[PDB]
Amino acid sequence: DIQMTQSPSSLSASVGDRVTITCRASQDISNYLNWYQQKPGKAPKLLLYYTSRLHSGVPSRFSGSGSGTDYTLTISSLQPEDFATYFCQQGAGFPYTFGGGTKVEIKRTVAAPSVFIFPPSDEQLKSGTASVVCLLNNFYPREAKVQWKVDNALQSGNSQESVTEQDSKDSTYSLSSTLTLSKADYEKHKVYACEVTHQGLSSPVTKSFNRGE
Amino acid sequence: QLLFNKTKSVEFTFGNDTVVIPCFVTNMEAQNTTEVYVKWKFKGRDIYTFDGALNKSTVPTDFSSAKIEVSQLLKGDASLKMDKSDAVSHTGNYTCEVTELTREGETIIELKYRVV
Amino acid sequence: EVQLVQSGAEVKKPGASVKVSCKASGYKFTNYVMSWVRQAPGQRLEWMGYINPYNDAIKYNEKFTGRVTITRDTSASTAYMELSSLRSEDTAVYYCAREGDFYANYGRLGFAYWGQGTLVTVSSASTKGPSVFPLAPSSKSTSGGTAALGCLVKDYFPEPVTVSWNSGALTSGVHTFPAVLQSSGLYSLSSVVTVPSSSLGTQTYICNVNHKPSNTKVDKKVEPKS
Ligand SMILES: *[C@@H]1O[C@H](CO[C@@H]2O[C@@H](C)[C@@H](O)[C@@H](O)[C@@H]2O)[C@@H](O[C@@H]2O[C@H](CO)[C@@H](O)[C@H](O)[C@H]2NC(C)=O)[C@H](O)[C@H]1NC(C)=O
Ligand SMILES: *[C@@H]1O[C@H](CO[C@@H]2O[C@@H](C)[C@@H](O)[C@@H](O)[C@@H]2O)[C@@H](O)[C@H](O)[C@H]1NC(C)=O
Ligand SMILES: *[C@@H]1O[C@H](CO[C@@H]2O[C@@H](C)[C@@H](O)[C@@H](O)[C@@H]2O)[C@@H](O)[C@H](O)[C@H]1NC(C)=O
Ligand SMILES: *[C@@H]1O[C@H](CO)[C@@H](O)[C@H](O)[C@H]1NC(C)=O
Ligand SMILES: [Cl-]
Ligand SMILES: [Cl-]
Numbered sequence A: 001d002i003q004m005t006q007s008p009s010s011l012s013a014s015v016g017d018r019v020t021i022t023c024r025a026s027q028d029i030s031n032y033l034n035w036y037q038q039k040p041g042k043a044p045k046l047l048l049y050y051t052s053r054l055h056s057g058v059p060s061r062f063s064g065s066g067s068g069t070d071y072t073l074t075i076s077s078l079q080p081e082d083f084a085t086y087f088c089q090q091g092a093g094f095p096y097t098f099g100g101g102t103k104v105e106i107k108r109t110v111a112a113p114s115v116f117i118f119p120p121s122d123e124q125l126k127s128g129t130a131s132v133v134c135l136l137n138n139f140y141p142r143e144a145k146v147q148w149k150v151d152n153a154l155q156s157g158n159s160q161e162s163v164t165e166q167d168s169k170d171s172t173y174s175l176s177s178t179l180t181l182s183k184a185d186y187e188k189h190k191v192y193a194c195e196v197t198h199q200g201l202s203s204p205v206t207k208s209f210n211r212g213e
Numbered sequence B: 001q002l003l004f005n006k007t008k009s010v011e012f013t014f015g016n017d018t019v020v021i022p023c024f025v026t027n028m029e030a031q032n033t034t035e036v037y038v039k040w041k042f043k044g045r046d047i048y049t050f051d052g053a054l055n056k057s058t059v060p061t062d063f064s065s066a067k068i069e070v071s072q073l074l075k076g077d078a079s080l081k082m083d084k085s086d087a088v089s090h091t092g093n094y095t096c097e098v099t100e101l102t103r104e105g106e107t108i109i110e111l112k113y114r115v116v
Numbered sequence C: 001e002v003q004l005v006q007s008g009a010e011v012k013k014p015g016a017s018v019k020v021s022c023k024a025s026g027y028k029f030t031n032y033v034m035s036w037v038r039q040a041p042g043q044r045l046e047w048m049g050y051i052n053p054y055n056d057a058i059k060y061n062e063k064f065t066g067r068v069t070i071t072r073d074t075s076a077s078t079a080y081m082e083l084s085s086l087r088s089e090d091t092a093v094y095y096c097a098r099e100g101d102f103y104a105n106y107g108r109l110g111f112a113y114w115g116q117g118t119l120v121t122v123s124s125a126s127t128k129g130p131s132v133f134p135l136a137p138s139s140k141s142t143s144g145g146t147a148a149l150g151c152l153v154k155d156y157f158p159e160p161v162t163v164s165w166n167s168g169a170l171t172s173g174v175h176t177f178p179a180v181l182q183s184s185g186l187y188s189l190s191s192v193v194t195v196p197s198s199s200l201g202t203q204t205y206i207c208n209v210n211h212k213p214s215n216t217k218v219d220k221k222v223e224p225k226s
Helices: A122-127 A183-187 B070-075 B084-089
Strands: A004-007 A010-014 A019-025 A033-038 A045-049 A062-067 A070-075 A084-090 A102-107 A114-118 A129-139 A145-150 A159-163 A173-182 A191-197 A205-210 B009-012 B019-021 B036-042 B045-051 B056-058 B080-082 B092-100 B103-113 C003-006 C010-012 C018-025 C034-039 C045-051 C058-060 C068-073 C078-083 C092-099 C111-114 C118-122 C131-135 C146-156 C162-165 C174-176 C187-196 C206-211 C216-221
Touching (some): A019 A084, A019 A102, A045 A062, A045 C111, A114 A205, A122 A129, A129 A191, A129 C187, A145 A173, A173 A183, A173 C187, B019 B084, C003 C092, C018 C092, C018 C118, C034 C068, C058 C068, C131 C216, C146 C206
Parallel strands (some): A010 A102
Antiparallel strands (some): A004 A019, A019 A070, A033 A084, A062 A070, A145 A191, A159 A173, B019 B080, B045 B056, C018 C078, C068 C078, C146 C187, C162 C206, C174 C187
16 A cells, blocks of 8 residues: 655644645655645545645645655645644555644744633532533643642642643633532532643632632 | 447548547536546557546657547547547557546547558 | 535444445535545544445445445435444544545545544443533633633543534634543533623523434523622
């Protein structure tokens, strides 16, 4: 089979930068190479077919070139909505094969998180569990430190967090962290606090609530 | 599958202007030539191809004069055209294979050369 | 518009079989080859095969021969991919795909139209529907006149859940986070939205949670707290 190898694996660049990624095939594929764009959780979108032909609708800042075994895709002026993973696909011989993909992320300015905290709902407490959710909205860079405190005692081992993919409009990220306790352990305390450290904040931000208020 | 207005053979002399091998699809339905691929085979070799998707023709060196009239292709007309040099060098059976969307078909024409 | 709509996500026990469907619309179904490509989470896409709906010809990848079966129902404008003898490595998103307005090139000139994907998880664990709890807005979730609210979709297996807001009429400001895997092997995610805090008394916010593996559909009204 024809093996496809892309480089780099991931990539970071500012808005307006020229970005170039390379696809390489294990044998000549005679310009039968296609480029796809895929955003997380979405289906791929055809960008270029036959090395350099723009698929209808694709903005002109996308372009491809190459021959034999070496091909490149180039975005002339990188845009926020260009965040995605880009895949190449050889159309030369069966079975058709795809590259491993190049992730393209945007460099932008520092943006602080907006922080929100949510007590458990009565529905969940009725079931016997208490989840406290802390939300960090539209920040950059994507690293944020979240410290749960219960009656001013730092927690560890009872929370989980995930971070969104990069936003396709403002290039920010958002984070959600969930402290989970039993209804009993939850009721043994009063103050529930979420402390957030981030490059956009001049000092850590804390949001908190007293249980039963 | 595609259907043809068939023709057993055509004949030329050196008094011909251009040599034309006819090929006519009756049940043509394409709307853009991007939906069509035309291949002309002579003695096994692909001696002419038109890639409608890439708007790209291909002939080997000994058939440097071979062409089809792309403007006429959507009417069902895939007739091959060449000059006398290429034709008299390559007398015999020609295959016209037409692909349109998901359909395909072919037909055979014999090119005959008559000395006056 | 061309549109490829696929069947819902499924969980299958190892060894069983799955049949993903793909209904085409917006064009003449027999005019174009329907291909199938799958993508395991975190891996690259891989071609599986195609079918010519006109002459019913099919071609398969050598890796799936004996297991994969592509078929079409012309009157239904529907292609089908059926994979059998499922392994936990058949866990992937399965796509149907279609070429552009070209002659039948089977993907040599690229797949121009894709379905939305069908996530098939191969596992022996029993499917489990989610619980949906509200993340009510209050004084603790405001910020400069904006308010945050959401839904917590907790304890379900397998992925995925889809969350929409107000049956799709609310998309601006929505963040639906990637799921985390809890120590119990169940998934949990949150979906949030920011809205004006001023209109909390006049607007209505419902999250629509769909977990197709368990056929669970849940609408949760998120009422503000005071
Ligand atoms: C070659 O040309 C003839 C027409 O030219 C006549 O024949 C030459 C060989 C030459 O001897 C001249 O004096 C003549 O003027 C083509 O025959 C005509 O083809 C058209 C199109 O099908 C048809 O409508 C006419 O009836 C034909 N006339 C005839 C048969 O007398 C012939 O098809 C050409 N051959 C090739 C291979 O292109
Ligand atoms: C055929 O199409 C021509 C341009 O086609 C362009 O490229 C192809 C691959 C499609 O993606 C199409 O949507 C693009 O616009 C037209 O210039 C030409 O007029 C068309 N033919 C007819 C008869 O209208
Ligand atoms: C297609 O191309 C026409 C002319 O291009 C020439 O002829 C074709 C058959 C190819 O062999 C090409 O390499 C040549 O340069 C144009 O006049 C016509 O507008 C084009 N049509 C479309 C729809 O692109
Ligand atoms: C062309 O084909 C016919 C049968 O299809 C055959 O009788 C004839 O001899 C062939 N002419 C050639 C090969 O020149
Ligand atoms: Cl993380
Ligand atoms: Cl997002």
